[PDB]
Amino acid sequence: SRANDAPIVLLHGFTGWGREEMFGFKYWGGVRGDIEQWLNDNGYRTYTLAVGPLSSNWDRACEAYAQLVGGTVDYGAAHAAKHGHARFGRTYPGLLPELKRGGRIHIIAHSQGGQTARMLVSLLENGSQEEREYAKAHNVSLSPLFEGGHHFVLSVTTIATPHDGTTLVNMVDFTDRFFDLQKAVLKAAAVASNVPYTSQVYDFKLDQWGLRRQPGESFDQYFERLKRSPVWTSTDTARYDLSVPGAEKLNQWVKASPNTYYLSFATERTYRGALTGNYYPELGMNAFSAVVCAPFLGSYRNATLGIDDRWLENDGIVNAFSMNGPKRGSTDRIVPYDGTIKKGVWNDMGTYNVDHLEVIGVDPNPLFDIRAFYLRLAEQLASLQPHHHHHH
Numbered sequence: 001s002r003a004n005d006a007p008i009v010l011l012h013g014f015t016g017w018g019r020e021e022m023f024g025f026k027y028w029g030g031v032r033g034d035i036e037q038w039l040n041d042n043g044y045r046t047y048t049l050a051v052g053p054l055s056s057n058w059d060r061a062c063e064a065y066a067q068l069v070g071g072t073v074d075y076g077a078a079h080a081a082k083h084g085h086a087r088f089g090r091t092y093p094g095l096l097p098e099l100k101r102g103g104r105i106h107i108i109a110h111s112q113g114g115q116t117a118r119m120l121v122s123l124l125e126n127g128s129q130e131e132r133e134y135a136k137a138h139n140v141s142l143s144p145l146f147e148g149g150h151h152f153v154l155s156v157t158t159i160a161t162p163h164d165g166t167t168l169v170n171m172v173d174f175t176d177r178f179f180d181l182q183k184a185v186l187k188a189a190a191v192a193s194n195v196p197y198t199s200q201v202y203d204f205k206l207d208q209w210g211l212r213r214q215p216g217e218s219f220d221q222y223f224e225r226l227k228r229s230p231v232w233t234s235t236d237t238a239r240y241d242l243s244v245p246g247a248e249k250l251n252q253w254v255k256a257s258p259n260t261y262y263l264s265f266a267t268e269r270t271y272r273g274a275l276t277g278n279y280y281p282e283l284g285m286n287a288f289s290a291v292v293c294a295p296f297l298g299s300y301r302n303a304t305l306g307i308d309d310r311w312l313e314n315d316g317i318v319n320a321f322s323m324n325g326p327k328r329g330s331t332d333r334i335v336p337y338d339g340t341i342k343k344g345v346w347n348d349m350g351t352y353n354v355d356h357l358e359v360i361g362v363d364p365n366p367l368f369d370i371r372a373f374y375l376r377l378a379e380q381l382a383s384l385q386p387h388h389h390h391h392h
């Protein structure tokens with residue numbers, strides 16, 4: 001039963017948007033309803049973060065921090081100079097100023113949101129040594145995020161997260177197929193990609209790069225520009241962090257805090273072929289993934305990169321092997337759930353038979369009780385002890 005009053009905060013990956021965007025079609029719930037509202041109605045206070053879908057985990061973490069406590073996004077002077085984007089971004093009121101008073105949160109993160117949540121915890125706790133030294137050397141101001149010593153996060157739950165990257169980015173036409181996927185999610189919200197909507201609809205939040213959809217421009221045309229922009233061509237991107245090498249680099253510094261609980265949920269929607277050893281999309285998998293992504297994921301091997309048969313099972317977008325927690329370039333530990341949730345370690349809650357989009361309701365699946373999944377999750381997080389005691 002209930003051991004903590006920490007609010008829940010929802011977080012998205014390489015696709016996602018605010019509650020007011022997509023004409024109210026929720027990323028968290030999609031065609032099935034409104035997950036945040038379900039939790040609130042059942043007495044679990046729950047909020048939603050919206051950060052750049054295509055931006056690096058770093059950028060997203062800085063935007064999350066500021067969206068949480070209030071203020072103007074500060075990406076870091078060292079970081080901004082290193083990648084050639086703006087240091088300061090959007091300004092936020094702050095969802096939870098209670099955080100600046102000892103309060104804590106549970107983060108439920110989906111897809112690449114799980115990388116972002118991990119990095120947010122690491123910056124909060126440790127800050128950035130490079131940013132601290134840079135401010136010292138150059139006499140610039142320094143965001144509190146980079147100082148260290150914050151403890152906002154009681155737990156982090158990840159769902160279908162590419163902790164070790166996804167081999168989807170190795171597709172030779174990944175660039176086009178990835179934006180086609182963005183178009184498919186627009187399609188899910190009944191939004192056309194060949195129309196210059198004058199209202200914003202889907203804000204990619206690229207204030208650090210000075211990019212936004214222009215009047216007269218459809219998403220199709222907007223995506224053609226973005227493909228050529230630094231948010232697609234630079235290392236300071238979701239594209240890079242999403243790749244196996246990019247994820248591995250992230251894992252080399254983003255460690256599990258000893259003060260935080262970690263829960264991992266994996267997802268699969270495939271079956272194994274007995275003659276090929278490959279994996280193939282199940283019935284019911286979102287159309288786009290089934291045609292465009294899953295066949296590659298379930299068959300792509302690369303010996304020098306360390307991509308072997310274990311990587312083939314997938315949920316249509318991410319390899320299931322990548323989801324239980326960071327392993328490549330990581331010292332984090334991962335323990336299979338045994339009734340007991342342990343602190344400072346990845347508690348691998350196993351693998352669920354739902355695809356990348358079904359798990360948040362963006363694609364339908366009447367066999368998946370989505371309301372009960374999230375309510376069971378919520379009740380699990382509410383039962384977490386903020387301070388466990390050692391015992392026999």
Ligand SMILES: [Ca+2]
Nearest residue numbers: 284285286364
């Ligand atoms: Ca489905």
Ligand SMILES: [Zn+2]
Nearest residue numbers: 056059083236
């Ligand atoms: Zn950046």
